[model samples]
Target chain A: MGAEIPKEMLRAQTNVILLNVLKQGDNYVYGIIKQVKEASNGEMELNEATLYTIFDRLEQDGIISSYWGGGRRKYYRLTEIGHENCRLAFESWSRVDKIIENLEANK
Target chain B: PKEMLRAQTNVILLNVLKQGDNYVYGIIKQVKEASNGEMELNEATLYTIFDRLEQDGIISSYWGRRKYYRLTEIGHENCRLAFESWSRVDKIIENLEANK
Candidate 1:
């Protein structure tokens, strides 16, 4: 059965989704949009502006970097710290996922 | 120590209440027990969570020396919706992992 997922939850998790995409390889913001949808299995579609807004902070935080190269407009790649942050994010995602899964199965 | 988990306190607290109703500290204690201390929603954050939910009339408070919180039917309905929201996130993470 399908459940009605509140839109607020989707907005909240978008940044973490962005990090997961960058881990794959350097990609421009548009394609980063593509990457998230690609990995999303059709569950999410992000607005370009919102995607870039979140990207700004990620780049500023040193979790991601941007530059023109390879004939692309701009590309975003994870920094060394970005890779570790992505690892931490994946772990955090899994931890909460398991907890909620447990909660659902409880008395 | 899950940071993202802290932001999902409403969903967690509602789920916790489904197991049983609890006061402010009891909610915190229950979360600690449930997550095995991995996600602690402390007193600092929960009052705000409670304030909003109570103000919205999703939950009701009763006093017996210490205060207790009980979910109204609306609260339970909201909890079920919140549960579904997390479940959506669960699949998103699952798919992302597969892509990994």
Candidate 2:
């Protein structure tokens, strides 16, 4: 297999992905897992715990929030601050994406 | 950047700590169990979360002669905030579906 993408890159993109999903609306953990995987087309994977861990991080930063669903399910949503963060992050990713596209074109 | 990482870690760490003061190993075990073996946090990640949370005054750790972790009032608040953030994101998704 090719070299794995650096964890730092993965971590950053993962946050973007998580925020993007939340930007859509409230979702339970399993739901988040499904959406994230679908959006990434299986390129990125988050174990359940890592998902929760990320959830925790987002919440701490005031980017997202969570609540309990019926039957022990925990759900998550974004906040006003989270929306701003997501937009800023998306802008950064857009610029990064353009650079990568240009680099690949040069190659 | 650090704040984001710290925030997320605090959410997870506080949740774990809420369970009670646990041995470092024990905390990892619980994470594994909660994630159904899908997430395995190494010692460094665990301790890093701990350090950040403690600094945030969200949670605290003590030697306990064995090094254990517990949640403080601030930690609980963080947990509540985490849930709130998730809910907000979740709602946005619902609105999208309604339009589509």
Candidate 3:
């Protein structure tokens, strides 16, 4: 929150978290917040502003899709393209994770 | 508009408009869809961006169950800025790949 993380890394990790959440299925805003909170051990809290901003960017780029359920509430679903990107993100993380583990092992 | 609000909402508006003219519901749908079902935009934040864009003449609205908007010429111009900024962002990521 208070610059504990670099801005660039924060953005990247947020994308990673978002993609992982979507892989589960279509979800509403509140549900997404709840799921992510549980998954991250309550380490991440997405403010309304930041969440909406990321939502817009990803949607515009054709990475995901959404629709409204009953009560005029919207629910989100990942597009095929979004799934492809999620795989790419995971692969990148795997590479990074390997490096981190090796460094830790040396230490 | 407050500067912080403008900065955040502009990013939001540009994203909604990226899918072309859409009503409030459609914009909300686009936000969630784009994030691959992981993101949602609330009604309040959506309208805040719409109001700012209307004020700046970046987009114009029409009557619908909700307001519908298409980009203005100025809005199209602003997209150039979004494009340029994102291009640089792509380069940074490429660098990340190189180092990794």
Candidate 4:
């Protein structure tokens, strides 16, 4: 396991990974978490409580939709708004990273 | 900036104050250097956080050749918590990079 990340930081980036995962294909909650962990090479592991909370918020905000699937497993998919928001989220993070990179270059 | 990032800036500023008594210009300069210029704390942002920290009683200011700031006991605790919170996220990112 890696060092514990702050809740706030995790909250900020949750959508980045979640949306990207959904973009790959529709998946259930546990499946999304599994994909993120694998993509990060096991570097990232999300707690169920936090993941559910984010899912609930995203659903409420119309960023995602959910439906009961095999054996009561709930599958999730991103909405049109979710796609746009995901793009914006990634863009903002990239911009910030560029700022840091430029600053380091100057140094 | 996102709310979390904005909050992190405050934490970083508080951590800098925990080092010792420092004035605004010096604090900003020190952070920029410490972060290898990756962090550029502007004057307005520094003063705003300083004022807020003083109002919250996390830090105190005194008159010298220039106004100097020092963390109170509460501020010391706050700085420690902030650093811990920040480092957790930092470590995860470092791990991800390593795996990549």
**Best-fitting candidate, measured by DockQ?**
1
TM-score of chain B of 4: 0.73
Clash pairs, model 3 backbone: A59-B34, A64-B33, A64-B34, A65-B33, A66-B33
For A1-107, candidate 3 gives per-residue lDDT tens digits of 11122356458666766765676667777877766665545655777677778888889988888898827767888999888766765665454434334323432
lDDT tens digits, residue span A8-104, model 4? 6556665656676677668887876666676656867887888788888778889889888728888887798878876775675565555445434
lDDT by residue (tens digit), candidate 1, B12-96: 7866766667788877766676688887777978887778877887777899689988887777776687667656665565534
Runs in model 4 lying further than 4 Å from the true structure: A1-54, A59-70, A76-107, B81-100
- Which parts of model 2 are misplaced by more than 4 Å? A1-107, B1-11, B97-100
Output the number of the TM-score-best candidate.
1
| Tens digits of per-residue lDDT for model 3, B1-100 | 2543344445555645654677878766655554345445687977777777678777888886667788876777666654654454433322222223
What would you estimate as the lDDT of candidate 3?
0.63
Report the CAPRI category for model 2.
Answer: incorrect
Return the number of clashes found in candidate 2.
Answer: 32
Compute DockQ for each candidate against the true complex: 0.29, 0.02, 0.01, 0.11
Docking class of 1: acceptable
Tens digit of lDDT per residue, candidate 2, span B12-93?
A: 5555566567878977776655545645668998777667767767666679769877888766665565456545434434
The clash count for each model shown is 0, 32, 5, 0
Candidate of highest lDDT: 1
**Decreasing lDDT order of the candidates:** 1, 4, 3, 2
